[PDB]
């Protein structure tokens, strides 16, 4: 392809690129509001969390760190902030 709009790449193909290979690098992670099933308390949790986050009320582990995104425990619902 000799002629191509480098300043306005297709947003579909722009999203398949590596996170450092976009026009402006941008994280694909986000922060979430996590509802444990046991109670209702807003707890902001990083999507790629490295910590076994526990809610303040009861000392129950909410998520377990993995290689990539943290895994929410069963009964825990997330909403992207």
């Amino acid at each position: 392809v000799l002629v191509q709009d480098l300043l306005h790449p297709s947003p579909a193909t722009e999203a398949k690129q590596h996170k450092l290979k976009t026009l402006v690098q941008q994280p694909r992670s986000f922060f979430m509001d996590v509802k444990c099933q046991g109670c209702l308390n807003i707890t902001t949790v990083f999507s790629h969390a490295q910590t076994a986050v526990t809610c303040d009320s009861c000392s129950t582990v909410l998520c377990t760190p993995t290689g990539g995104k943290a895994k929410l425990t069963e009964g825990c619902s997330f909403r992207r902030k």
Binding site: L2, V3, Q4, D5, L6, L7, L23, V24, Q25
Partner: protein, 129 residues
């Protein structure tokens, strides 16, 4: 490591122009790169180019129009006396009637013809034709 961002910029421009592409992406940007491109743009060897701010060194997208034969840096940026400018244009330029040697002088970045007009000299920076 990355020792000359101007060399990276001109190599990308050369590779895109030799391969027939009409646009090229340059990373990283700098003041010297932008002022080098403005001289090339001023003589018509390239078209409009665009600077993208990413809160970092930056990126540039240059539009090529096929008139550029070759642009390059001179590393290191040798000191050039006024009497030595004649010798440099003979070695680097294809003829005595066209082509420009880019210098960095205390009066600013300019072509060898402009440097003779304002009677200034500095360090050699590159060439374009």
């Amino acid at each position: 490591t990355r020792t000359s961002v101007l060399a990276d910029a001109l190599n990308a421009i050369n590779n895109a122009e030799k391969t027939g592409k009409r646009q090229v992406l340059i990373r990283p940007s700098s003041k010297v790169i932008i002022k080098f491109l403005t001289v090339m743009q001023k003589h018509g060897y390239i078209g409009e180019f665009e600077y993208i701010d990413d809160h970092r060194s930056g990126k540039i997208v240059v539009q090529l129009n096929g008139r550029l034969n070759k642009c390059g840096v001179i590393q290191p940026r040798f000191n050039v006396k006024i009497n030595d400018i004649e010798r440099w244009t003979d070695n680097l330029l294809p003829a005595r009637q066209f082509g420009y040697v880019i210098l960095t002088t205390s009066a600013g970045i300019m072509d060898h013809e402009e440097a003779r007009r304002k009677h200034v000299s500095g360090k050699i920076l590159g060439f374009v034709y």
